[PDB]
Design an enzyme around this catalytic site. Structure first.
Site, PDB file in Angstrom:
ATOM      1  N   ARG B 340      -6.596  -5.719  -4.307  1.00  0.00           N
ATOM      2  CA  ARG B 340      -6.372  -6.623  -2.959  1.00  0.00           C
ATOM      3  C   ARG B 340      -6.469  -8.132  -3.052  1.00  0.00           C
ATOM      4  NH1 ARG B 340      -8.578  -2.106   0.348  1.00  0.00           N
ATOM      5  NH2 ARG B 340     -10.044  -3.512   1.390  1.00  0.00           N
TER       6      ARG B 340
HETATM    7  N1  LIG Z   1       4.103 -10.614   2.373  1.00  0.00           N
HETATM    8  C1  LIG Z   1       3.274 -10.286   1.546  1.00  0.00           C
HETATM    9  N2  LIG Z   1       3.373 -10.669   0.219  1.00  0.00           N
HETATM   10  C2  LIG Z   1       2.619 -10.692  -0.731  1.00  0.00           C
HETATM   11  N3  LIG Z   1       1.599  -9.737  -0.859  1.00  0.00           N
HETATM   12  C3  LIG Z   1       1.093  -9.164   0.502  1.00  0.00           C
HETATM   13  C4  LIG Z   1       1.925  -9.493   1.445  1.00  0.00           C
HETATM   14  N4  LIG Z   1       1.325  -8.610   2.647  1.00  0.00           N
HETATM   15  C5  LIG Z   1       0.449  -8.134   1.950  1.00  0.00           C
HETATM   16  N5  LIG Z   1       0.080  -8.402   0.745  1.00  0.00           N
HETATM   17  C6  LIG Z   1      -1.134  -7.844  -0.275  1.00  0.00           C
HETATM   18  O1  LIG Z   1      -1.850  -6.902   0.424  1.00  0.00           O
HETATM   19  C7  LIG Z   1      -3.218  -7.264   0.132  1.00  0.00           C
HETATM   20  C8  LIG Z   1      -4.090  -7.514   1.412  1.00  0.00           C
HETATM   21  O2  LIG Z   1      -4.674  -6.032   1.912  1.00  0.00           O
HETATM   22  P1  LIG Z   1      -3.849  -5.319   2.837  1.00  0.00           P
HETATM   23  O3  LIG Z   1      -2.675  -4.752   2.313  1.00  0.00           O
HETATM   24  O4  LIG Z   1      -3.502  -6.212   4.173  1.00  0.00           O
HETATM   25  O5  LIG Z   1      -4.604  -4.383   3.420  1.00  0.00           O
HETATM   26  P2  LIG Z   1      -4.623  -2.786   3.745  1.00  0.00           P
HETATM   27  O6  LIG Z   1      -5.501  -2.045   2.515  1.00  0.00           O
HETATM   28  O7  LIG Z   1      -5.174  -2.458   5.075  1.00  0.00           O
HETATM   29  O8  LIG Z   1      -2.968  -2.475   3.452  1.00  0.00           O
HETATM   30  C9  LIG Z   1      -3.309  -8.515  -0.467  1.00  0.00           C
HETATM   31  O9  LIG Z   1      -3.819  -8.276  -1.854  1.00  0.00           O
HETATM   32  C10 LIG Z   1      -1.785  -8.869  -0.581  1.00  0.00           C
HETATM   33  O10 LIG Z   1      -1.409  -9.472  -1.765  1.00  0.00           O
END
Ligand SMILES: Nc1ncnc2c1ncn2[C@@H]1O[C@H](COP(=O)(O)OP(=O)(O)O)[C@@H](O)[C@H]1O
Ligand SMILES: Nc1ncnc2c1ncn2[C@@H]1O[C@H](COP(=O)(O)OP(=O)(O)OP(=O)(O)O)[C@@H](O)[C@H]1O
Ligand SMILES: Nc1ncnc2c1ncn2[C@@H]1O[C@H](COP(=O)(O)OP(=O)(O)OP(=O)(O)O)[C@@H](O)[C@H]1O
Ligand SMILES: [Mg+2]
Ligand SMILES: [Mg+2]
Ligand SMILES: [Mg+2]
Lengths: 470, 474, 470
Positions: B340
């Site tokens: 993450r």
């Molecule tokens: N548009 C995006 N581009 C690249 N990475 C993303 C994007 N949106 C989310 N991420 C990735 O998601 C991670 C953030 O956790 P998230 O996925 O929001 O939480 P969850 O576990 O609730 O899905 C980050 O490591 C980020 O790299």
């Protein structure tokens, strides 16, 4: 109001004995505030929620804060009403805990604020409305293939680390950027790291005043993690019952709401059922989600994320919520690890308002052609892997040639991802989305290299990126 | 009053009369001199768990309350020692002589006290550094089955911190003591002992001690974090902590739960794991990063405790015994391991190369699943299979041979740009080591450029340096 | 001082000591009664205290069957735990749980030294470790998971897999070589195998280097609990006070825990796990920790463990798995196939498979063997679905050589002369490595796969192939 002494402490659970016989009602609020008389005693202020009556003037209570240092015989006072979160205009730009006390150091709310009990009987069929209104988000995939609806409940499903919270945050940001409406965000058992990140992102975006926040952190007792969603909902009530406008309410992870309910049941000795779940599971889920309705006045539209443990959707917690959802969005890790963001599966995501008369027939026809092309591509990839792209005939070749570009163009850069890639972000109008997809399906851009479609917004941005790459 | 007789004794638990002014969690001592915690207050009795050898206690014994919470002694003198959950040495060498003490039950760093995780934590494991990066403050979980290289990764991590300025702690819960000694000797032989502390709560120790061991570790970690130094903490098994807590709860007659585990499992593990943090510039910038371990039967990742700990952490490193015996060690499933903080806890050249590396690996992971069975394939189908095979070979490394970051980014640059095309797969493993030697002797300027700049060197110098080595290699 | 029996429910009894003195936990009490009339039965019993109850009452686990017990019987307090005769006198003799001898050869006088069975374990400073290989002459253990001198060895299996054959083979070879004092304790065994082993030892003359404690299936749970502790207590004196290297043998340790679980419900313990007592891991670690090698002396402990339903993931085997340094897991499939013994090549492990302990060539050979076996393990599922004519040359060669290998892991045994009528063999490590190197390189592909079955050395493989007429 009236006072009684503690008799038993067994962790979160506490028991009180109101000797005189005037007992608090269920779901009431009790307050413990103590000052040490001898050097061995501690100072504690504690909030207790009544759960049962046990006879002979004793009640059983679940604590909302850590019970360490409790002493038998110390006084508990009865407030006379449920836990009452203060609501109004005073809660904009502020962050609170479950008890409605401000976490932020920006100040403390005075006695002036109007206070609303968290536990209230659900609205009747007094004025509930059957009308359907579409809510625009500006995201190509979501607006095209799974439109959201005012007053409806929308579900985000996926594993850990797939993109749910980023999607929620950019939804908040785009709603404030274009629609300009209020929102309320409640975190059920949220991580301190991500909650801090959300506060800092809202401060940077200039949104914190538009939205309100209630925080419930994992290191808190189960009952507070349970009740935080209800106090967030009670905050969202005021802006459509009194202020009479189109509100949104976001919930971080309902999964933790169900888990905290099961844990509280275990602490209370209630017999387990199903896969360890509490007896009263759906009576809690429904009592949550049935106050989130659009009357004639206001919507309280909700977008929610729920965690599926092991790629299996049959677990009781996902299953119960699946019976409440108007639109469901499924986020796939295979998409998330591809270059295609946001990771939303076109075919697994559906909305009951995709009906042609609700969205308009042009929208419906474009979406249907999109899904047909994607399904044909999914089927043909098996042949492509072994025999290649050149084995299949011209119709299949053109189908895959359009399908890859459709897959890329569903992706777009967004304003909350600035941290992750250093690119600005874009918003696409719904008519622009449908027109661009119509042009792609009709094939006005066959000559362009497929790389131009990778992460831009409108189709003229594809043209500009194609000009840039050369 | 404070005086009262003991009315029951058994299995490390007691019940007592009197004690009408006792508090929850208060430490209590018997006439035998052993100490225990009051945990249940009832209408006319108190439930006490004993922190020591309990066989001497009898019915009718008078019991006393200390009046305090359990306090762990904290100081800089603990570094290099081996200690109990209590503040008492078990390594010999006399008293540790700490400065002062801290209550172990404490509140955690709150919101707005934390900055975003931006500074890397280096393990020297090419696969973890490239595809599952970690930063100071991140709570990364390592989970797997038996005998699939779990503790070799924690030892590799602690050993590598020699070059950096980290403080490390190793907490062993419910383990056999000779295993503790073997790990201590493995650490000492590689010189890491001076910047580490080892906390030992063996299974033979009374059950309440294993209940308090992780909090014992975090108490010292917190002191070092609040001073302003960076800290790394490893818990070798939370599963045994959960088992000890279940046993203690059942003996107390608290109502059961899903797998007979009590209702306080999530409360306890979250209270434990929320103390990890990355502090703000106002606090001092200290960081307490944790790497908890969980092992559960037969690769069933779906149990109660595994899912709790997966829900609390910021990532998981999934270790598979299937992959171990296939020749890929340490056996890490890149597909099922979630990062993450992927691009935020890396140096710039690591981000730049590792994004394309992960693209290659994700592309290969599906095609390999079934394309190999069909012997005849199109020309371009097999190429990605070859690339993925060379990738999986390049990500393998020997035990206790951690790597500095810049050599990693150099060899991965060699991999991604396709410089390894001429080299047969078997020569690839030797290619990496001879390439490292050649860059050490001849192409030191690239290492200097990365060491100073924290960025990828000029493409011409990197290409010339990598191309020069390929001429010698046969 | 005397106490009256007030309750009896099978194994458990409830003495009441109303004299004003109470026994400590783990103490031993005595019942000796003379029948007053023809109805009463004369009884001689001892009871160990297990739990203190409230009013001058203790819960006592009976050491022998409780028939004839009358409420109101009088119980003597010995004032100390179970005492075991310690010294050189133990050599040759066989004893029961209480310390009396079982063979008719004599008695042990009052002057002999006697020690209690319950005491704390060794500390961290006292332990020591080394890496030296302990050669077994068994091809599988020697080449894929070498045992180590002074290291805990574990044999895991369900009913009828080959555990006791391995115990007997190891005891035969090691007692042939080592100049060590030996203690053999059989917990929950067949009482016939004890006599058979006694006679085999008398044939071997090792009985003077051995001391034996026996409690088997036909005994109430208390003896099954304490027998292993008695055998360990003897090994303790030999390790420390004499300072002589000792071997401790225990077959099917599990019944120690099983007997504890059976009486656990009678002791008022709430259930846990799969019926097991709450205090499982505490007791298992308490036993296992005392079996350690210190600087004063070293114990090589070889143990066999039983699984209640042959599910390795069962709680009891899972807890024990953490205390071992080398493990061989035997499971039924290899027994069905005819290859013996039933050790799993890909799940048996030791701390000694490292080039700094066994050398480079040995380590490379072992790991390459395991790789080939895993490749065939997945290829079985592939071949079932697709057939065996769709594989390529290299995929076919993998199957060929895996078949050639897992047969060679079978060996003609010494103690299996009765079962199969064959001489037996002892295979040196160097010869195993040479033969396996010959196998992996394809030096013996031409031989039919039957030639590789149940032979000692590759020369015997060539001899058997010559017998087949190839
Ligand atoms: N548009 C995006 N581009 C690249 N990475 C993303 C994007 N949106 C989310 N991420 C990735 O998601 C991670 C953030 O956790 P998230 O996925 O929001 O939480 P969850 O576990 O609730 O899905 C980050 O490591 C980020 O790299
Ligand atoms: N890079 C490597 N190459 C070869 N072998 C390795 C490598 N890394 C680890 N191993 C092996 O993997 C094993 C790891 O042992 P370790 O005790 O640390 O694992 P564990 O999974 O924590 O074990 P357990 O479940 O028994 O507690 C050792 O046998 C070690 O030799
Ligand atoms: N090496 C061998 N060669 C041939 N037959 C064998 C061999 N080892 C075992 N057997 C056969 O398998 C049987 C296994 O019996 P054994 O006493 O070894 O069982 P076990 O694994 O100890 O089981 P239990 O726990 O039920 O006592 C033997 O009686 C014999 O018939
Ligand atoms: Mg999230
Ligand atoms: Mg371990
Ligand atoms: Mg047996």
């Amino acid at each position: 109001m009236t006072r009684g002494r503690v008799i038993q402490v067994m962790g979160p659970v506490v028991d009180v004995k109101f000797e005189n016989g005037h007992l608090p009602a269920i779901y009431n609020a009790l307050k413990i505030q103590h000052k040490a008389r001898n050097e061995n005693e501690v100072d504690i202020d504690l909030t207790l929620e009544v759960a049962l009556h046990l006879g002979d003037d004793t009640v059983r209570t679940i604590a909302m804060a850590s019970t360490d240092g409790l002493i038998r015989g110390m006084e508990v006072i009865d407030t006379g009403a449920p836990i009452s979160v203060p609501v109004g205009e005073v809660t904009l730009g502020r962050v609170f805990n479950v008890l409605g006390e401000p976490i932020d150091l920006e100040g403390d709310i005075p006695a002036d604020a109007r206070r609303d009990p968290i536990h209230r009987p659900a609205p009747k069929f007094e004025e509930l409305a059957t009308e359907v209104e579409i809510l625009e988000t500006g995201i190509k995939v979501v607006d095209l293939l799974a439109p959201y609806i005012k007053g409806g409940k929308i579900g985000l499903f996926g594993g850990a680390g797939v993109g749910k919270t980023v999607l929620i945050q950019e939804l908040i940001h785009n709603i404030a950027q274009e629609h300009g409406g209020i929102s309320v965000f409640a975190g059920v058992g949220e991580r301190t790291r991500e909650g801090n990140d959300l506060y800092h992102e809202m401060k940077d975006s200039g949104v914190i005043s538009k939205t309100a926040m209630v925080f419930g952190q994992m290191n808190e007792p189960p009952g507070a993690r349970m009740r935080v969603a209800l106090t967030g909902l009670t905050m969202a009530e005021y802006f459509r019952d009194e202020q009479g406008q189109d509100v949104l309410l976001f919930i971080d992870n309902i999964f933790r709401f169900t888990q905290a309910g099961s844990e509280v049941s275990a602490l209370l000795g209630r017999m387990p059922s199903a896969v360890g779940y509490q007896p009263t599971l759906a009576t809690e889920m429904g009592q949550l989600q049935e106050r989130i309705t659009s009357t004639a006045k206001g919507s309280i539209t909700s977008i929610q994320a729920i965690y599926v443990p092991a790629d299996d959707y049959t677990d009781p917690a996902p299953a119960t919520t699946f019976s409440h959802l108007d639109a469901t969005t499924n986020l796939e890790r295979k998409l998330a690890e591809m270059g295609i963001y946001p990771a939303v599966d076109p075919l697994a995501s559906t909305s009951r308002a995709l009906a042609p008369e609700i969205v308009g027939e042009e929208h419906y026809q474009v979406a249907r052609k999109v899904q047909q092309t994607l399904q044909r591509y999914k089927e043909l990839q098996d042949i492509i892997a072994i025999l290649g792209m050149d084995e299949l005939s011209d119709e299949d070749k053109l189908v895959v040639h359009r399908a890859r570009r459709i897959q890329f163009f569903l992706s777009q850069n967004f304003h909350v991802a600035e941290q992750f890639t250093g690119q600005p972000g874009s918003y696409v109008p719904v008519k622009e989305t449908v027109r661009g997809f119509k042009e792609i399906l009709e094939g006005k851009y066959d000559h362009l290299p497929e790389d131009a479609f990778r992460l831009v917004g409108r189709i003229e941005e594809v043209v500009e990126k194609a000009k840039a790459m050369g | 009053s404070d005086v009262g007789t003991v009315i029951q004794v058994g299995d490390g638990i007691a019940r007592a009369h009197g004690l009408d002014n006792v508090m929850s969690g208060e430490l209590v001592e018997f006439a035998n001199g052993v100490m225990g915690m009051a945990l249940n207050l009832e209408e006319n009795n108190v439930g006490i768990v004993i922190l020591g050898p309990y066989t001497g206690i009898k019915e009718g014994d008078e019991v006393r309350r200390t009046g305090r919470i359990m306090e762990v002694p904290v100081g800089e003198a603990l570094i290099g020692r081996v200690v109990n959950p209590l503040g008492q040495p078990v390594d010999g060498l006399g008293p540790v002589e700490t400065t002062e003490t801290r209550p172990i039950e404490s509140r955690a760093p709150g919101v707005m006290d934390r900055r975003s995780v931006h500074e890397p934590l280096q393990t020297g494991i090419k696969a973890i550094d490239a595809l599952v990066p970690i930063g100071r403050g991140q709570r990364e979980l390592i989970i797997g089955d038996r005998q699939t290289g779990k503790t070799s990764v924690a030892i590799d991590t602690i050993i590598n911190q020699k070059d950096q300025n980290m403080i490390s702690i190793y907490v062993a819960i419910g383990q056999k003591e000779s295993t503790v000694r073997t790990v201590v000797e493995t650490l000492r032989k590689h010189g890491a002992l001076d910047y580490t502390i080892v906390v030992t709560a063996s299974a033979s120790q009374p059950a309440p001690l294993l209940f308090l061991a992780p909090y014992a570790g975090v108490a010292m970690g917190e002191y070092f974090m609040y001073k302003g130094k960076h800290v790394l903490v490893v818990y070798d098994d939370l599963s045994k902590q959960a088992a000890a807590y279940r046993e203690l709860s059942l003996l107390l007659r608290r109502p059961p739960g899903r797998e007979a585990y009590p209702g306080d499992i999530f409360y306890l593990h979250s209270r434990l794991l929320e103390r990890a943090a990355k502090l703000s510039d106002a606090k001092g910038g200290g960081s307490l990063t944790a790497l908890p371990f969980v092992e559960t039967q037969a690769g069933d990742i779906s149990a109660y405790i595994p899912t709790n700990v997966i829900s609390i952490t910021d990532g998981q490193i999934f270790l598979q015994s299937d992959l171990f015996f296939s020749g890929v060690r340490p056996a890490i499933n890149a597909g099922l391991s979630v990062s993450r903080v992927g691009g935020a806890a890396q140096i710039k050249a690591m981000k730049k190369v590792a994004g394309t590396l992960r693209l290659d690996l994700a592309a290969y992971r599906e095609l390999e699943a079934f394309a190999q069975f069909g012997s005849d394939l199109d020309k371009a189908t097999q190429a990605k299979l070859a690339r993925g095979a060379r990738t999986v070979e390049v990500l393998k490394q020997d035990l206790h041979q951690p790597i500095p970051v810049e050599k990693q980014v150099l060899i991965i640059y060699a991999l991604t740009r396709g410089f390894l095309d001429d080299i047969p797969v078997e020569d690839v493993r030797r290619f990496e080591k001879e390439f490292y030697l050649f860059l050490d002797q001849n192409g030191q300027h690239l290492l200097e450029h990365i060491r100073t700049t924290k960025d990828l060197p000029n493409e011409d110098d990197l290409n010339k340096a990598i191309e020069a080595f390929k001429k010698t290699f046969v």
